[PDB]
Amino acid sequence: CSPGIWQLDCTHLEGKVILVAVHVASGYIEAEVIPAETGQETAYFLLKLAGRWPVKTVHTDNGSNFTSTTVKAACWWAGIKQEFGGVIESMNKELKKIIGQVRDQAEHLKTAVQMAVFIHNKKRKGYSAGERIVDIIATDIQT
Protein backbone atom coordinates (compact mmCIF):
# COMPACT_ATOMS: atom_id res chain seq x y z
CA CYS A 1 0.00 0.00 0.00
CA SER A 2 1.08 3.59 -0.60
CA PRO A 3 2.67 5.34 2.42
CA GLY A 4 0.20 8.22 2.03
CA ILE A 5 -3.19 6.46 2.06
CA TRP A 6 -5.43 6.90 5.11
CA GLN A 7 -8.93 5.69 5.96
CA LEU A 8 -11.23 7.78 8.15
CA ASP A 9 -14.56 6.84 9.73
CA CYS A 10 -16.68 7.65 12.77
CA THR A 11 -17.82 5.31 15.52
CA HIS A 12 -19.94 5.98 18.59
CA LEU A 13 -19.70 5.14 22.28
CA GLU A 14 -21.66 6.44 25.28
CA GLY A 15 -23.54 8.86 23.02
CA LYS A 16 -20.30 10.50 21.83
CA VAL A 17 -18.73 10.69 18.37
CA ILE A 18 -15.26 9.20 17.83
CA LEU A 19 -13.41 10.10 14.62
CA VAL A 20 -10.82 7.45 13.73
CA ALA A 21 -8.00 7.59 11.18
CA VAL A 22 -5.91 4.57 10.17
CA HIS A 23 -2.72 4.48 8.12
CA VAL A 24 -3.63 1.52 5.92
CA ALA A 25 -0.09 0.31 5.19
CA SER A 26 0.93 0.20 8.87
CA GLY A 27 -2.22 -0.14 10.99
CA TYR A 28 -1.24 2.98 12.94
CA ILE A 29 -4.29 4.91 14.15
CA GLU A 30 -5.28 8.24 15.65
CA ALA A 31 -8.62 9.00 17.27
CA GLU A 32 -10.41 12.02 18.73
CA VAL A 33 -13.73 12.45 20.48
CA ILE A 34 -15.41 15.28 18.58
CA PRO A 35 -18.39 17.29 19.91
CA ALA A 36 -20.35 16.90 16.66
CA GLU A 37 -20.18 14.67 13.57
CA THR A 38 -19.82 17.67 11.27
CA GLY A 39 -17.59 18.79 8.44
CA GLN A 40 -16.13 21.51 10.67
CA GLU A 41 -14.85 18.96 13.19
CA THR A 42 -13.75 16.52 10.48
CA ALA A 43 -11.87 19.25 8.61
CA TYR A 44 -10.09 20.37 11.79
CA PHE A 45 -9.11 16.75 12.52
CA LEU A 46 -7.73 16.35 8.98
CA LEU A 47 -5.61 19.52 9.06
CA LYS A 48 -4.00 18.33 12.30
CA LEU A 49 -3.34 14.89 10.81
CA ALA A 50 -2.01 16.33 7.54
CA GLY A 51 0.53 18.40 9.47
CA ARG A 52 1.91 15.32 11.24
CA TRP A 53 2.12 12.72 8.44
CA PRO A 54 2.37 12.80 4.64
CA VAL A 55 -1.37 12.56 3.93
CA LYS A 56 -1.95 12.21 0.18
CA THR A 57 -5.21 10.25 -0.10
CA VAL A 58 -8.07 9.76 2.36
CA HIS A 59 -10.75 7.11 1.86
CA THR A 60 -14.08 7.56 3.66
CA ASP A 61 -17.66 6.45 3.25
CA ASN A 62 -20.32 8.92 2.05
CA GLY A 63 -21.12 10.32 5.48
CA SER A 64 -22.27 13.93 5.23
CA ASN A 65 -19.35 15.13 7.36
CA PHE A 66 -16.85 13.53 4.97
CA THR A 67 -18.48 14.93 1.81
CA SER A 68 -18.97 18.41 3.28
CA THR A 69 -17.61 21.46 1.49
CA THR A 70 -15.54 22.37 4.57
CA VAL A 71 -13.63 19.09 4.24
CA LYS A 72 -13.18 19.69 0.51
CA ALA A 73 -11.68 23.08 1.37
CA ALA A 74 -9.25 21.58 3.89
CA CYS A 75 -8.19 18.79 1.52
CA TRP A 76 -7.58 21.30 -1.28
CA TRP A 77 -5.57 23.53 1.07
CA ALA A 78 -3.47 20.61 2.33
CA GLY A 79 -3.13 18.75 -0.98
CA ILE A 80 -5.26 15.73 -0.04
CA LYS A 81 -7.14 13.65 -2.59
CA GLN A 82 -10.48 12.25 -1.44
CA GLU A 83 -11.98 8.93 -2.51
CA PHE A 84 -15.36 7.49 -1.56
CA GLY A 85 -16.78 3.97 -1.66
CA GLY A 86 -12.98 -2.72 5.56
CA VAL A 87 -9.70 -1.89 7.28
CA ILE A 88 -11.20 1.04 9.20
CA GLU A 89 -14.46 -0.82 9.91
CA SER A 90 -12.50 -3.65 11.54
CA MET A 91 -10.34 -1.00 13.21
CA ASN A 92 -13.39 0.61 14.81
CA LYS A 93 -14.23 -2.78 16.32
CA GLU A 94 -10.62 -3.25 17.44
CA LEU A 95 -10.55 0.22 19.01
CA LYS A 96 -13.83 -0.38 20.86
CA LYS A 97 -12.44 -3.66 22.22
CA ILE A 98 -9.34 -1.94 23.62
CA ILE A 99 -11.43 0.95 25.00
CA GLY A 100 -13.53 -1.50 27.00
CA GLN A 101 -10.40 -3.19 28.35
CA VAL A 102 -9.12 0.08 29.85
CA ARG A 103 -12.44 1.89 30.37
CA ASP A 104 -12.36 1.54 34.16
CA GLN A 105 -8.94 3.25 34.26
CA ALA A 106 -10.49 6.62 33.35
CA GLU A 107 -13.62 8.58 34.21
CA HIS A 108 -13.99 10.30 30.83
CA LEU A 109 -14.38 8.45 27.54
CA LYS A 110 -11.93 10.79 25.80
CA THR A 111 -9.20 9.64 28.19
CA ALA A 112 -9.96 5.96 27.52
CA VAL A 113 -9.92 6.56 23.75
CA GLN A 114 -6.38 7.94 23.89
CA MET A 115 -5.31 5.14 26.23
CA ALA A 116 -6.65 2.64 23.68
CA VAL A 117 -4.88 4.40 20.79
CA PHE A 118 -1.65 4.27 22.79
CA ILE A 119 -2.02 0.53 23.43
CA HIS A 120 -2.90 -0.22 19.81
CA ASN A 121 0.05 1.70 18.39
CA LYS A 122 2.67 0.52 20.92
CA LYS A 123 1.78 -3.20 21.02
CA ARG A 124 4.36 -5.39 19.27
CA LYS A 125 3.33 -8.26 17.01
CA GLY A 126 8.15 -7.83 15.59
CA TYR A 127 7.21 -4.17 15.22
CA SER A 128 4.34 -2.12 16.58
CA ALA A 129 2.05 -0.04 14.37
CA GLY A 130 3.82 3.12 15.51
CA GLU A 131 7.18 1.64 14.52
CA ARG A 132 5.84 0.44 11.16
CA ILE A 133 4.46 3.80 9.99
CA VAL A 134 7.69 5.57 10.96
CA ASP A 135 9.68 2.91 9.10
CA ILE A 136 7.44 2.97 6.02
CA ILE A 137 7.53 6.76 5.66
CA ALA A 138 11.28 7.08 6.26
CA THR A 139 11.96 4.53 3.50
CA ASP A 140 9.72 6.53 1.15
CA ILE A 141 11.75 9.71 1.75
CA GLN A 142 14.03 10.46 -1.19
CA THR A 143 17.80 10.84 -0.91
Ligand X SMILES: O=C(O)Cc1c(-c2ccccc2)c2cc(Cl)ccc2[nH]c1=O
The entry of a second copy, Mg ion, ligand X, none near residue 52 (CB within 5 to 8 angstroms by kind) is a second copy
From residue 71 to residue 90, what is the string marking binding to ligand X with x (rule CB under 6 A)? --xx--x-------------
Q: Report whether 67 contacts 83 (CB < 8 A).
A: no
Whole-angstrom distance, CA of residue 129 vs CA of residue 68: 30
Interface with Mg ion (CB under 5 A), residue from 38, 47, 63, 131:
63
Number of alpha carbons in the 13 Å side-chain half-sphere of residue 3: 13
The entry of a second copy, ligand X, Mg ion, none near residue 9 (CB within 5 to 8 angstroms by kind) is Mg ion
Q: Report whether 45 contacts 65 (CB < 8 A).
A: no
Shortest distance, position 116 Cβ to Mg ion, whole Å: 19
Shortest distance, position 80 Cβ to ligand X, whole Å: 11
Shortest distance, position 57 Cβ to a second copy, whole Å: 13
Rounded to 5 degrees, φ, ψ at 6 are -130, 150
Q: Which positions touch ligand X (CB under 6 A)?
A: 40, 43, 69-70, 73-74, 77, 106-108, 111
